Each structure stands twice: as C-alpha cells, then as structure tokens.
Design a protein around this ligand. Structure first.
Ligand code: 7BL
Ligand code: NA
Length: 994
C-alpha cells in the first residue's frame, strides 16, 4: 500500500484484511512475507574483490607496460652473462611500479565510505507487533515485519517500517522526522486520512516513516510499505541507480593514456621500418637471435621512456597535501579527485537558511493599529534593537525609544507572542551567552516579549538566568494554556485556546490567539483591534495592512512578516473537535486583527563578498529557499545574486510554477534561473539533471536524506557539518562551518591546485618525451644504447618525482578568480604548449645521445672513434681491421651511458626551474621563490651522486663516477635548456599573448 495516507483506517485494514485486535495470523505472515519480502534494505552485493585489481589492468597503456614486464623477464634468464644480483632488476622494478600504481587505483577503502551502508543505520533491530498466535505484544526482528502487521510504537522507539497510524493511545503522538524533514521539530501526527493522494511527506500527518523515531507518545498502526517500498527505500533506490561519473581531469588522463599507447605502438613499428635494410642482408652474417634481442630490449626500453610512471604517485601526494589545506579553511573533502574538480565548479546551488544566513532570527519591526475612522487609517510602526536571541535591546518609534507598556495594542502583541509559543530562551554557562530552544522563529517571538516588557516587571533586580523568561512567564500567569492548534501547511498558522486564571482581568470568557501567514490570517479577520476597542475590518484598513506587509517583505529590509490575530468569542471546549486538523481552519475564523511582527534572518558576514567572487570567477550561484517568491527575490537582491534594479521575472521560480511548466521549459528555466522558492523534495535532483545537460559542473547542497539523491547525483555533493551522516557520506565535500563563503573558498583553492598540478604534468611528460627521442635516435642510427630502462624508471620515479611533487607548493595567481571556470572539454596540452614541450623535450634527446656520442667520438679520456664505424659497433669481432683499438667492452662501457644519464638529470633540474611558471620569466620570478623546490632539487642531485659513489648502486644502474673533466661537459650541454625555455616563454608573452 503506497497511498495508505489518503485512505481511512478502516480501508487500510480492509485491504490487507487484518483485525486491529489480534492482528495478522501466522498463515498470513508467510503469505505476505513471500509476496512482499523481508523489511530490510538490500545489502550492497557485487562488491569489489580481487576483480578490483583486474580493473587497474584493463587500460591499453597499462597492458603495454605489463607486456614490457613479461618481455623483460624473457630476456633476463636467456642470456650469456653471469650477472647474479643485478639481472632480474628490470622485471623487478617494473612490477614494483605496476604493483604500487595498481594499489593507488584500487585505493577506495580509506578515502570513500559507502552512503547506502550508512543509510542502513537508520533501520532498527527489532519492532513491536501484534500477531494472532499470542495475546500480549511480541517483538521480533524488524526484517520479519510485513505489510499488514499491526505494529506498536512508543517514545524512544525507532520506527521499523512505513506505518499507517490506526489509533493514538497516549494523549498526543510526536515524531522526530529530522532525517526526512531537516527541521528538528517533533511534528504531531493524527488518525484521520489526508485527502490528497499525491501529498508530500510533510503533509502526511497520519504516517510513521521508517528511520523516524518517536519523540513522545504511544500509538498502534498498520504497516503500509516495507524495505525498498518505504520512503527510505525509495531514497535508497535513487542513490543505487545514480552513477558517479569520473572528474574531467581523470577522463583526460585516461584519454592521454590512449594517445600515448598509439605513440608507443607507432614508434615500435617505425623502428622496425628503419631496419628494413636488414631484409637485404646475408644469412651467413649475424643471427636472428642477436637481432631480436636488440628489437625486444628497445621496445621495453621505449615503453618505460614514454610512460610517466611517476605521475600517479606525484598527484596523489599533491592532492593529499591539498586535502589538509582545504580542511584548514573549513572544508572537509572526502574523495581525493574532488579537490581538483572543485576548481572546475561552474554552478553552485545553495540553501538560504544556515548556509547563506546566520539563522539568528530576530524581530526587527512591528506595527499595530493606531486608529480607524472611515476612509482615514493610521498604523503604529515600531523598531527593535538586538540582532540576537538575547533580551538585551529596546523598542523605539521613529528612531526614538518608547515604553511599549503605554500601548494597549502592544500589550496583547506580547501576549500572543508569549502564549501562542512553544519555544523559550535559556542562558548558557559554558559558552556564556543566551541560547534558543525549539524553532528559530518562535524563539525570536519569546525574545521580543522580553525586550518589550509590556507589564513593566522588574528588570535590573533580576539575575542573568532568572530573567531569561521573565516577561513571558508573567504573561503565562494571566491566561491558562489549555491547548494549541498545530501548525499546518494548508492554512499556514497557529492558534492556542486559553482560559483566564482566577484573577479577574476583564477576560471575556476564553480566548484564542492566532499567528501565521499574513495574507492568509488577515483574510480570516472580520474585526480589527484599536487598543482596547474593536472595529469592523473594512477594505481601506485591509489595504493599509497588506501594503505594509508587502513593503517589509519586498523592500530592502527582507523581513519575514507574521500576522498576529485573536479570536474574541471562540467556540466552547466541547464544540471543538480537538483531533480534527482540518477543522482548525474554521476554529481560527472570525478573528480580530491585533498586529504584525517583522523578523529578519540576517545573511552571512562574508557572503556579500563571496557572491561577488563568483560573479568575477564566472561561477553561477542558484539560491534555494523556503521563503515566498517575493521575499526570496528580495533576499537575492540584497545578498548579490540579483541586482538592486534588474529583471528577475524569468530568472526566479517557485515549486508550484516549475511543475506546471513542460519538460523542455523546465530545462530552459534551469539554464538561466538562479532562485527557487518553495522547492519540492524531488526538485533538487531534477534541477541538477538539467544543469548536467549543459555540461555544467554543478554543486548542490543538502542536510538530510531527502537531499541525498540530489547530492550524490551532482558533481560536487555539498553537505553541512551539522547535517546527517547520510548527507555527509553521500557528499563529496562537507562544510565544517556551514557557510557559502567556505564553499567558494574551497573552489578558489581547487583552481590553484589545477594550475600547479597541470604544471608538473607537462613537466613529467616533457621528460618522458625526451627519453623517447633518446631511444629513437640511439636506435635509428644504430648507436650504442644511450640509456637503460632500469635507469629511466629511477629517473622518472625519484629524480623527476621529488621536484615534480615540490611543484605543488608553487605560488598561486593573483588573477585566478578573474577567469571563468575551466571547461570540461579543455585539453592539457594544445598547439603552442605542444610545440613548446616538444622542442624542450626533443632537445634532451640530442643532449643525452650527444653526451654519449661525445664520449665515443670527440672526448678527453675516451677512444677517438669515427661516426661511420661507431654506428656499426655490433660488428665488433667481425670487422677486425676497422675495429682496432680496445676490447669490445668499450662500446658497452658505463661512461657514455653515465654521460647521457647525467645530462638527463641536469636538464631535468633545470627544466623544473622552468616549470616554476608557465610563461613568467626567471628574471621576474627567481628560482628561489618556491623553497620546497630547491630542497627537492638538492635532494635529487644528492641522490644522483649517491647512485654513483656508494658501490652497491653504480653496478646496478651500469654507471661509473664522473670527475670534473666529464662533469664540466654535462653543464655545457644541459644548462642551455634554460636559455631555450627563456626564449620560448618570451615568444609566448610577446608574439602570442593578444
Ligand atoms: C587524476 C586524479 C586522480 C586521483 C588519484 C588519487 C590517483 C590516480 C592519479 C592518476 C594518474 C594518471 C596518470 C596517467 C599516466 C599515463 C598513467 C600511468 C603512469 C599508469 O601507469 C602506467 C598508472 C595509473 C595509475 C592510476 O590508475 C592510479 C590512480 O588512481 O592514480
Ligand atoms: Na555525488
């Protein structure tokens, strides 16, 4: 039964065919359980396992490197040399990375908790039910409960399933629907049915939702839906259906891996095409086994050269340091990639109360009737000081302090605000300041009564805590609080029946004091109050009242008006049906207008400027509120979303309007609108769907499980620090202080990371690009192998890793919030940036190969060999006459490879300095700006010396120590990289920046 709320208690029992006395029979229990199923949310199956490791080895590039691991292992064992400990290093270090890199990708245990599993924490263990097999009540597993069961609930008990209330045994039943409403006010339930079939959950005054807990009372009911059919279940299935897409950067890195795969496979064939001359060679000259060794050892060496295998570890460390940086600015980011994608935030949908406002409710203005006489009508406006729940303030008329006790209308004003009120103030000892109890609105009314002091009670003689509820307590002494009529969303008001105490205060029998929506309550007023006297509610007066109501709500004041009326001669205690909620409408009719109070929900202290930041940063901001459209628009004008004087007719919508519009116009509305009022529960997710259709990275916010579906569906799920765990588990970011400013503060930081992160990306790939050029040149010309894969890996991991990670601490841009959000379809490298790191990379290939060739041909301590025979070194012992110098070990010497490797490290430290900025010269920004970069470079070069000196190392990398005679040549060939980059950067700022 889905629409059990719109059915009578007799109908729900007739449908399931159940007896309210004995309940379901064990025969029905099996039949219902087999038809509907167990009352429990489905445990998340199809989880991750060893298969999650397989997913890391799915990409094409990772398979290439994996194949390089297998090919390397094949060439390892099959060899003549007896290199013992330094043989299986090539296959070993490959697995070290393939293991480490795979562990980073499988890392989804400590940095992302499941939201649906956290949602299972709201379903209780056991529940009370009445089965026909026994007399007294019997509790069982909540999962054993079925639709039709006559369940029982009391105070403290957590509701097992969606229950249709049958009968309330206690005086009144209260339930804390905080998880499904957000408003932590214990709502009151009833037995009578709700006429609307498609009524919202808040309107369901006769339902007990699963996950909800009873705040007070005890009642018996019949189970309508169970498990996935419950309100919690319907929310769960929405989250289980929504698939979280990968951040735009992640898609580009995957897209890059595909491009780099084509590059490797292309050159592997290109190398084979260059050696097409071997097809025209004799059989009696060399062997296929000698050739394949060079081809295979080239492919594996070419694979590691192109791949930036150090990148993943570099970014993970950067984002990890980015997480601690964001948490300091009050922004608890959950997932690592979320810190980067946060800068790409295009839209921000935020809630008014709590986030945009301080939620420090306080009555600012209040007007009553001064006198009515024919066409003439005069009011009496006032103003209140003290933007807080504290009583420290005063009332004044027209910027002049007054005594509210001398105004009869204001006396009854405080009377209604005191009696018709469930909230109260409370002084705190720990913090040392007044606090609120109940609703924010009603607490402001309590504070107002304390400020007014209409009876002039003692004030200075009272203590701090004792006077917290002084004037209000004095008011409660006059009238007795018989009973209150609950606040319903259909009439939007609250009244209270009050009988006079044994005091004789001119009390004409019993009275009712009503408060609620101005436009609604004023209509139910046939009379009007003028001090002590009464007059008939005429047109001119009704205009003057509603006009001032509109002036306060639409004006710059942005006040939440609240009309206060009273029923002079209410019906007797007997005639009033105390249970009928719909009858509260006529019980609050024939009222007499007393006055009105205008309160303000003051905006945040920083939102005034934070909104302006979004305007300059090209980020759109969409407010979502519960206030009326007129005031919601006025509030937007005040904070900065709207201008003081501009069009907003089609840029602002209500929940009522948005539904009436067609599907296409709803999408057309979401692209321009930025202010939604009276939003329905399903609107947050709908709006996000329309924002995602425009490829806009959206950031929706929420606090309860009602928003969970919208949060998880959004790119950047924004949750409150005070929100429920389900919201914080479903959110990508959690605001620690619940502020829209800290929302933008994190967005600004996310952009800064994007710049510094993308900087060391082009830095590392630029390194790998030159490594490929070194292999392609040393292979095409047929030179002695310039570099070895065992070396390159340590170069990309440590040598390039330390400085690359240090580039994350680079200074930000002063004009970062001036540019618009980064486009999701924006590449890492393009056009000029491609050529720039292509030339810078292409040079290192000639630097490394040239450094090695330098030792072979024109060197100091090296054997003078010519270029034409140096390219045919593989024919060592064959062509003896041409090769007449030293042992064949000379071509396989450690010196030349050390020259190529040493040059690679030297230029990389220099290229790291070139990567301090994108185009800014080293003259403008010195290389000592980033302190962490210098420290990493000192450590990088320190490690470069260590692998050469400490004997246990140089034998492994096939390298030997270099003296000043050889090191001087390294600086001569390496340092020119800075001058080249300086020329390139100069061309960018001059003949390109336009
Ligand atoms: C982009 C943001 C991702 C977040 C985190 C926390 C980790 C990612 C970082 C991704 C690196 C991608 C690099 C592209 C190059 C081309 C690929 C390799 C060197 C691959 O090795 C050949 C290794 C891929 C590792 C990732 O799958 C692990 C991961 O989650 O890292
Ligand atoms: Na999400």
């Amino acid at each position: 039964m889905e629409a059990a709320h719109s059915k009578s208690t007799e109908e729900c029992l007739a449908y399931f065919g159940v007896s309210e006395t004995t309940g379901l029979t064990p025969d029905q229990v099996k039949r219902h359980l087999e038809k509907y199923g167990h009352n429990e949310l489905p445990a998340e199956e199809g989880k991750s396992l060893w298969e999650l490791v397989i997913e890391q080895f799915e990409d094409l590039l990772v398979r290439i490197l994996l194949l390089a691991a297998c090919i390397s292992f094949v060439l390892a064992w099959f060899e003549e040399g007896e290199e013992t400990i330094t043989a299986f290093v090539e296959p070993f270090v490959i697995l070290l990375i393939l293991i480490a890199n795979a562990i980073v990708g499988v890392w989804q245990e400590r940095n992302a908790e499941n939201a649906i599993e956290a949602l299972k924490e709201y379903e209780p263990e056991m529940g009370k039910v009445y089965r026909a097999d026994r007399k007294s009540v019997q509790r069982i597993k909540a999962r054993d409960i079925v639709p039709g069961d006559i369940v029982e609930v009391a105070v403290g008990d957590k509701v097992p399933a969606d229950i249709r209330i049958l009968s309330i045994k206690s005086t009144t039943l209260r339930v804390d629907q905080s998880i499904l409403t957000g408003e932590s006010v214990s709502v009151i339930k009833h037995t009578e049915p709700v006429p609307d079939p498609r009524a919202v959950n808040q309107d369901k005054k006769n339902m007990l939702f699963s996950g909800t807990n009873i705040a007070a009372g005890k009642a018996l009911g019949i189970v309508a839906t169970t498990g996935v059919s419950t309100e919690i279940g319907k929310i769960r299935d929405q989250m289980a259906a929504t698939e979280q897409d990968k951040t735009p950067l992640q898609q580009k890195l995957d897209e890059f891996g595909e491009q780099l795969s084509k590059v490797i496979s292309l050159i592997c064939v290109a190398v084979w095409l260059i050696n097409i001359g071997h097809f025209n060679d004799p059989v009696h000259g060399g062997s296929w086994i000698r050739g394949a060794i060079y081809y295979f050892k080239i492919a594996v060496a070419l694979a590691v050269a192109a791949i930036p295998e150090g990148l993943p570890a570099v970014i993970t460390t950067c984002l990890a340091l980015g997480t601690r940086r964001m948490a300091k600015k009050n922004a608890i980011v959950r997932s690592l990639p979320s810190v980067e994608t946060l800068g790409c935030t295009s839209v921000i949908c935020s809630d008014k109360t709590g986030t945009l406002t301080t939620n420090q409710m306080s009555v600012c203005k209040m007007f009553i009737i001064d006198k009515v006489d024919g066409d003439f009508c005069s009011l009496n406006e006032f103003s209140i000081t003290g933007s807080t729940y504290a009583p420290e303030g005063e009332v004044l008329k027209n910027d002049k302090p007054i005594r509210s006790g001398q105004f009869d209308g204001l006396v009854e004003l405080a009377t209604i605000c005191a009696l018709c009120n469930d909230s109260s103030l409370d002084f705190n000892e720990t913090k040392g300041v007044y606090e609120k109890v109940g609703e924010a609105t009603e607490t402001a009314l309590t504070t107002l009564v304390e400020k007014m002091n209409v009876f002039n009670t003692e004030v200075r003689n009272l203590s701090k805590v004792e006077r917290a509820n002084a004037c209000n307590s004095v008011i409660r002494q006059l009238m007795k609080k018989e009973f209150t009529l609950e606040f319903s969303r259909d009439r939007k008001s609250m009244s209270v029946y009050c009988s006079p105490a044994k005091s004789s205060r001119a009390a004409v029998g019993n009275k009712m004091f009503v408060k609620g929506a101005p436009e609604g309550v004023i209509d139910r007023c046939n009379y009007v109050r003028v001090g002590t006297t009464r007059v008939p509610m005429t047109g001119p007066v009704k205009e003057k009242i509603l006009s001032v109501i509109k002036e306060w709500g639409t004006g710059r004041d942005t006040l939440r008006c609240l009309a206060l009326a009273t029923r002079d001669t209410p019906p007797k205690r007997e005639e009033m049906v105390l249970d009928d909620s719909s009858r509260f409408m006529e019980y609050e009719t024939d009222l007499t207008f007393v006055g009105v109070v205008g309160m303000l929900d003051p905006p945040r202290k920083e939102v005034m400027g934070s909104i302006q930041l979004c305007r300059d940063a090209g980020i759109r901001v969409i407010m979502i509120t519960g206030d009326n459209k007129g005031t919601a628009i006025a509030i937007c004008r005040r904070i900065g979303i709207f201008g003081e004087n501009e069009e907003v007719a089609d840029r602002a919508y209500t929940g009522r309007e948005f539904d009436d519009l067609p599907l296409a116009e709803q999408r057309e509305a979401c692209r321009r609108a930025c202010c939604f009022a009276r939003v329905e529960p399903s609107h947050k997710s709908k709006i996000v769907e329309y924002l995602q259709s425009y490829d806009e990275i959206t950031a929706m916010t929420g606090d309860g499980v009602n928003d969970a579906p919208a949060l998880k569906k959004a790119e950047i799920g924004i949750a409150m620090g005070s929100g429920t765990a389900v919201a914080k588990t479903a959110s990508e970011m959690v605001l620690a202080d619940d502020n829209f400013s800290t929302i933008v503060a994190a967005v600004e930081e996310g952009r800064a990371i994007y710049n510094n992160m993308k900087q060391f990306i082009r830095y590392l790939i630029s390194s790998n690009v030159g490594e490929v050029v070194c292999i392609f040149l040393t292979a095409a010309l047929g030179l002695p192998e310039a570099l070895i894969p065992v070396q390159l890996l340590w170069v990309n991991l440590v040598t390039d890793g330390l400085p690359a990670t240090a580039l994350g601490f680079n200074p930000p841009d002063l004009d970062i919030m001036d540019r618009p959000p980064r486009s999701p379809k924006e590449p890492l490298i393009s056009g000029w940036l491609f050529f720039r790191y292509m030339a810078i990379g292409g040079y290192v290939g000639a630097a490394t190969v040239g450094a090695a060739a330098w030792w072979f041909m024109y060197a100091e301590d090296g054997p003078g060999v010519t270029y034409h025979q140096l390219t045919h070194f593989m024919q060592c012992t064959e062509d003896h006459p041409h090769f007449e110098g030293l042992d064949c070990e000379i071509f396989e010497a450690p010196e030349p490879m050390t020259m190529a490797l040493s040059v690679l490290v030297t230029i990389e430290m220099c290229n790291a300095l070139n990567s301090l900025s994108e185009n800014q010269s080293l003259m403008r920004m010195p290389p000592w700006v980033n302190i962490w970069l210098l420290g990493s470079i000192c450590l990088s070069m320190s490690l470069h010396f260590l692998i050469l000196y400490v004997d246990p190392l140089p034998m492994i990398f096939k390298l030997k120590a270099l003296d000043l005679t050889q090191w001087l040549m390294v600086l001569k060939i390496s340092l020119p990289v800075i001058g080249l980059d300086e020329i390139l950067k100069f061309i960018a700022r001059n003949y390109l920046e336009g």
